Design a protein around this ligand. Sequence first.
Ligand SMILES: [Mg+2]
Ligand SMILES: [Mg+2]
Ligand SMILES: [Mg+2]
Ligand SMILES: [Mg+2]
Ligand SMILES: [Mg+2]
Ligand SMILES: [Mg+2]
Ligand SMILES: [Mg+2]
Ligand SMILES: [Mg+2]
Ligand SMILES: [Mg+2]
Ligand SMILES: [Mg+2]
Ligand SMILES: [Mg+2]
Ligand SMILES: [Mg+2]
Ligand SMILES: [Mg+2]
Ligand SMILES: [Mg+2]
Ligand SMILES: [Mg+2]
Ligand SMILES: [Mg+2]
Ligand SMILES: [Mg+2]
Ligand SMILES: [Mg+2]
Ligand SMILES: [Mg+2]
Ligand SMILES: [Mg+2]
Ligand SMILES: [Mg+2]
Ligand SMILES: [Mg+2]
Ligand SMILES: [Mg+2]
Ligand SMILES: [Mg+2]
Ligand SMILES: [Mg+2]
Lengths: 159, 168, 175, 213
Amino acid sequence: TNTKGKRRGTRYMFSRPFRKHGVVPLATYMRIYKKGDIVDIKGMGTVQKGMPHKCYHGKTGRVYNVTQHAVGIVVNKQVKGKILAKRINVRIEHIKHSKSRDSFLKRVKENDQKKKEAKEKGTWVQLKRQPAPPREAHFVRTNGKEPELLEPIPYEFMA
Amino acid sequence: FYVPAEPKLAFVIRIRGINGVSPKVRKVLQLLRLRQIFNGTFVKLNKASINMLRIVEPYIAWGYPNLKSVNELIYKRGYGKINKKRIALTDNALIARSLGKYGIICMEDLIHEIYTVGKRFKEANNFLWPFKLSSPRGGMKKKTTHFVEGGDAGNREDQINRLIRRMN
Amino acid sequence: KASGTLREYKVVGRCLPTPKCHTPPLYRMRIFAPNHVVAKSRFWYFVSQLKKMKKSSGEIVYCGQVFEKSPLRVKNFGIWLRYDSRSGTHNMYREYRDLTTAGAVTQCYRDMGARHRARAHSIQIMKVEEIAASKCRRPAVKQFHDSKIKFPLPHRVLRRQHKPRFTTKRPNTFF
Amino acid sequence: GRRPARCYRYCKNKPYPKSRFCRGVPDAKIRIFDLGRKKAKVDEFPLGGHMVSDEYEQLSSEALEAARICANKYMVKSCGRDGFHMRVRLHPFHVIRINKMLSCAGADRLQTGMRGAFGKPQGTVARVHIGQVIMSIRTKLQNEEHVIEALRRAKFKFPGRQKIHISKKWGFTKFNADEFEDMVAKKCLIPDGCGVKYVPSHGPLDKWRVLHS
RNA sequence: GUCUACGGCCAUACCACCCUGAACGCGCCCGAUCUCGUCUGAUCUCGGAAGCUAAGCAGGGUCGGGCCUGGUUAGUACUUGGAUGGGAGACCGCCUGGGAAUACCGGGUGCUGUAGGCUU
RNA sequence: GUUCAUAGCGACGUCGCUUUUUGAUCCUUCGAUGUCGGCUCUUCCUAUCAUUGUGAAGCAGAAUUCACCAAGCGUUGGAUU
RNA sequence: GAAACCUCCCGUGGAGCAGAAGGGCAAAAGCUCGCUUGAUCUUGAUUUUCAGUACGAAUACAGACCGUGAAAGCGGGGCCUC
RNA sequence: GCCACGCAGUUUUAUCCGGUAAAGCGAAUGAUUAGAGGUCUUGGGGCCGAAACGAUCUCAACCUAUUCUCAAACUUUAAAUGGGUAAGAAGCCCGGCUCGCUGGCGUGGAGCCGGGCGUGGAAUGCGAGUGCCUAGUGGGCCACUUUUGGUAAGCAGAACUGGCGCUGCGGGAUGAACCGAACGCCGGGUUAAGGCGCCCGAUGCCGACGCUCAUCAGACCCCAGAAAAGGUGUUGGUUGAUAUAGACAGCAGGACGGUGGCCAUGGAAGUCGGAAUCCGCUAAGGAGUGUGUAACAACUCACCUGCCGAAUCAACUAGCCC
Ligand SMILES: [Mg+2]
Ligand SMILES: [Mg+2]
Ligand SMILES: [Mg+2]
Ligand SMILES: [Mg+2]
Ligand SMILES: [Mg+2]
Ligand SMILES: [Mg+2]
Ligand SMILES: [Mg+2]
Ligand SMILES: [Mg+2]
Ligand SMILES: [Mg+2]
Ligand SMILES: [Mg+2]
Ligand SMILES: [Mg+2]
Ligand SMILES: [Mg+2]
Ligand SMILES: [Mg+2]
Ligand SMILES: [Mg+2]
Ligand SMILES: [Mg+2]
Ligand SMILES: [Mg+2]
Ligand SMILES: [Mg+2]
Ligand SMILES: [Mg+2]
Ligand SMILES: [Mg+2]
Ligand SMILES: [Mg+2]
Ligand SMILES: [Mg+2]
Ligand SMILES: [Mg+2]
Ligand SMILES: [Mg+2]
Ligand SMILES: [Mg+2]
Ligand SMILES: [Mg+2]
């Protein structure tokens, strides 16, 4: 009984944030997108051309094609019990770079720097990041102060 | 006050059966290698493993084993996964042929690596087949509720040793 | 929380140090629990209610059993508590006579269960205090403040009713 | 022609206000929410007594009207017509519907049963939560027992369980009675009508110097 | 320490009123032959340089409004998972983790890129 | 209810019970459970009309009304349909 | 004159954008002018429903021929969802 | 240092996405309660203002600051759970070449060719990838939780997971779905859920502490029957009060004068009603809590006093029982 409209249910999804209507800031147009880099699809509603479908809002894909105003993105979409890599053309207003990829490339560069430096200076260093370890043993000083005694408060109806 | 180091080794025992299990709990139990009730596994404790234990909290009883518990578990019920087969650890050569490249060549080396979580704890622990423990002699309190509310599920700090003594 | 014979635990905890306070304050509570695991759980429950603390955001620096300093002396205990009834929350002050504080609190838990059908998860023990015999308010406790207390055991029911199960003589209740 | 209130006691549906979608709603039974000397100043009636529900349920507009009438009659009888002020703190904003069936000996007469069963607006009820105030009475400090008795009598007109609570606030204000006097003395509060205006220590100094003058 | 041209983020930058402004500048200002538009040289376009910081503009001020950021609200509301927990129900409590928002009370009131000036 | 809330009633509200009404549903029955009423006959229920024993009254008597224990016993002859 | 026109001031849009509603929009996407026919000729790819079939609708390109503007550009119908 | 191609209904670490729960309405849009303060008007008007409402009194509308209560088709703010991506050898870094695309530029982009880097760059687990042919099915139902219609339904319709269907076994006496647990044929040991008077295995413990008497007692998830309202039954608890300056309860007195107070009147004299609550005697007395008298009258109460000599009273609250 649901309609199959392209923008059904996008009332808040494609709406602008509070007090952020009007002219689109130009740094979004000034961003550079190469083939192979990772972008997040958002889909602002001020620009009605090149809009992604509502199923790609919030998804992340890889750029494979660059045109004058849009990019081609390979983004995974789950349909029933299969995931297929859809290719969508999205204008650059509706995308932004992925800071997850940015941080990963930064970490790779920093790890390569550490490898070179540590091979230069001999001593082995850890590069694989570990999960949070159990807390080590330590001493807690009282500083000559008795810890405060806490008791539950009596009940009373307030309002 | 001297706060001891947070324990880095846990023993996890699956206490509930295999009927009517939600998919996430089922997956995490499979990743912990607890596919049967009263199966035990040593788990190296960190943020990821602790969060997995929190996910499967109603289905398991876990705690911090001591040296005696590790010794009893390895010696009485220790089986190796040698060539994908469950082989009883009746000889030191069985351990040496599978773990000697890591320096573990005997029952004592295996027990040391399990107890003091060493560099090759993952290899030493995965070499061990999950322990097939008996039913708890003397019974349980209540398997359907948490330990801190009078039951058996969840994290009992060091009463897992009492549970192990009754369990194997 | 189930029960047994409860024990008193001094539990001291604090928040984990953060780059806002390097030495967070230490907080101490008296927890009456079956064991130290339940004691730590109840400590976290109470400090979460009172301060803005969590088990994950803090740590417990001490948890030790408090032995009774005079278990060979009968004494009067006043217990201030609060509990949730079926239709509200109430504050109660109760009195018991016992040798140990933990035994008095166990008596309180059993008595609340008996008289008000209050389960131990509904009960919050907020103060336990040894009180003088002249400060007692409950007549069932005050009637034992007699230097010349004297009473018999009137109607002694046979408890060995199955050893023997069959006999010729009918039991005597007067002794 | 009204159904028993047991058929609409519980908050089973989503809130269904009288709006541009729900049209044709009959007017609520209760139209007056404030009674007694409403023009009395704040210091005139220092004592406030609330009646507080203990159940999450729906109170009908007719029930609110009946409770208001009962409390008003007892308060007028006891404390006089100018010795109290009552405020009903519940408004019947939730429309309850009825799927009307024909009460005749026939189902062939286009009854249709459960087909197209969405109902027509029957009435309006107020949704009340646990701990929410239903009625409030402010009066002199010596009429506390009369307020308690009036609210106790009004309790019998409602389905669930209600408690009578003598609030610590001064009258209908949100400020504690013990702090009210010295707050008015230091001019943190300015009386107007039945309420007080809180005067914070920020803003233009012209508003500060019109006070203290 | 500032300004101008072009900006990036788009109120910590806005709004109301008041005070101050050296030198460049930006302006207000003067005029309609040409260029160009008008009901109207008001606007736009053009040609200027007598006067003025009155205004714009810049800086500052206001127990200022707003905005931004904190505290409180509050481990409250709400919530993942659990129980052969309670209750006639409505609902509620506990265990295991996560965790808000008003009112109220504080602090702040643009940062900065390129190019070019002024400031002894 | 001449006064008097509650002898007897009970507005506005609100809580229930019953399955002797009519609905709602469609779980059983469509290789079929004979579908209304009357007649006949037995048994059961009590939310008691009468009768037995009681309490109350705006119970003087008489009559009546309200309520309790209570289903032992009875609850009819006819015109029209 | 309460509403005719003229003037100033305030005015974040509380108007308008054909229609239902929602989103979007201010030297806009609204109003008024000027010039026009990109509502034209073509091949593929893609999104939406989806079985990843079709139709319909839509998005980004590419090749012609054009319109407009000083130009950057924009335009192959209607601001988007029928 | 080193121990497989690769994968995952899982976590961790980064990084985005969202508008539900909650919250808000002295924030927009709608709905909505009550006062307060102001000053213009085709508000009513207002008593002596026509005369310049000489005046200014009230009620409107309006504005301002507050105030009560709300929203599935409202929202500034905004969770939990959740959805996507990344966590390297297809990577990183050096050079060099090609281009008809782009272009101030040896520019940008893409491709291609050599070379060097292994600490294999979170945890945990698991061996993966791929093709062909293909049956049956396409009536479902149930439970926790979320949820729409309906008074409700063993009703109708959705979301999530599990189950029954397709499944036996232990327990719930009995039972498609509940709880435990899933199954080759057996011996021994131990448990789960549930139990241990007898049926019927197991408390034939010298079990612990209390609560409860029912002339319809009560007795264990689903579940197989009950509510509002009451109780001077009993047990706890909260708040308040009185008391050797003698409480409480009983027994016995006074309970007045003005004043048989005023306006109600046909009697209402304290009590058929409206207002106000005086004074003094003091031991106290309401110019009255009730009975009643046609009305008087006569009683009672709250108030005090006498006898009595130690504790007592009230209102709530929630357990079992009624
Ligand atoms: Mg199960
Ligand atoms: Mg045994
Ligand atoms: Mg379960
Ligand atoms: Mg009826
Ligand atoms: Mg509904
Ligand atoms: Mg300010
Ligand atoms: Mg919680
Ligand atoms: Mg009358
Ligand atoms: Mg037949
Ligand atoms: Mg037959
Ligand atoms: Mg009867
Ligand atoms: Mg073209
Ligand atoms: Mg278009
Ligand atoms: Mg939505
Ligand atoms: Mg809400
Ligand atoms: Mg609003
Ligand atoms: Mg159904
Ligand atoms: Mg079948
Ligand atoms: Mg199956
Ligand atoms: Mg089965
Ligand atoms: Mg069975
Ligand atoms: Mg049964
Ligand atoms: Mg056996
Ligand atoms: Mg049995
Ligand atoms: Mg037996």
